[PDB]
Design a protein around this ligand. Structure first.
Ligand SMILES: CCCCCCCCCCCCCCCCOC[C@H](COCC(F)(F)F)OP(=O)(O)OC
Ligand SMILES: [Ca+2]
Ligand SMILES: [Ca+2]
Lengths: 129, 127
């Protein structure tokens, strides 16, 4: 229930909170939960940020205001502003968009404060997850 | 990284939309079979999955090309030129060696996707 437009916005937030980051390269295949989907137990703080992010999205999907995501995930996108590494979700976002924007903001901030362990990058999910 | 870069994935997405009207690339060609999505292994479950395996192999070949050495540290700096005309994809001749190779990978996959049957029963599997 996720779209490319949504992923692109999340990527934007990470770029906002973490100057010089390359989101796909850094977070698309890290630990057990950083990337699309996830399984098992998060291996460190950053991985927990991702798992928390995914659970927040699950919560979003359960919101009545997000029912449209069941058949049209690619039809929705929230607005946010980046100012000097600070993320602000737009007041014009509808209930569903606002919740998702907040999930992404919490994740980007979490990523920015969690240690990055190269050893957990490209983890053998078929053994550790 | 797998997929090369977000912008590379976005370009591939645009090319798939060109070849398959009404398609939603991430929704359709992501998390399908054993090869459509992040990496992949095992026996492709169907033609579409084989299209994905081939695309994955192609990106691997790209990263191994001498002309694509810059992709090693700065994969997010790559981008190519192509045109879309009534679902027909044309990789621009101005593309350099590396860009040309990647455009070709994407073009072959987009075409392959457009002719491969889509089996919903192969979505979200496990290979
Ligand atoms: C087949 C064509 C594919 C087209 C895709 C083009 C879009 C490319 C943009 C995506 C790459 C941006 C990289 C951003 C990181 C990926 O983020 C992955 C994941 C997505 O969020 C999952 C959620 F459930 F929360 F919605 O975040 P997380 O689980 O926190 O793990 C980091
Ligand atoms: Ca995840
Ligand atoms: Ca793959």
């Amino acid at each position: 229930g996720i779209s490319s437009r949504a992923l692109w916005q999340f990527r934007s937030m990470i770029k906002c909170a973490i100057p010089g980051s390359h989101p796909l390269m850094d977070f698309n295949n890290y630990g057990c939960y950083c990337g699309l989907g996830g399984s098992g137990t998060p291996v460190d703080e950053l991985d927990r940020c991702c798992e928390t992010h995914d659970n927040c999205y699950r919560d979003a999907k359960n919101l009545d205001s997000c029912k449209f995501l069941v058949d049209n995930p690619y039809t929705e996108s929230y607005s946010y502003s980046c100012s000097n590494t600070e993320i602000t979700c737009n007041s014009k976002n509808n209930a569903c968009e606002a919740f998702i924007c907040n999930c992404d903001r919490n994740a980007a901030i979490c990523f920015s404060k969690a240690p990055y362990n190269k050893e957990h990058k490209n983890l053998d999910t078929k053994k550790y997850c």
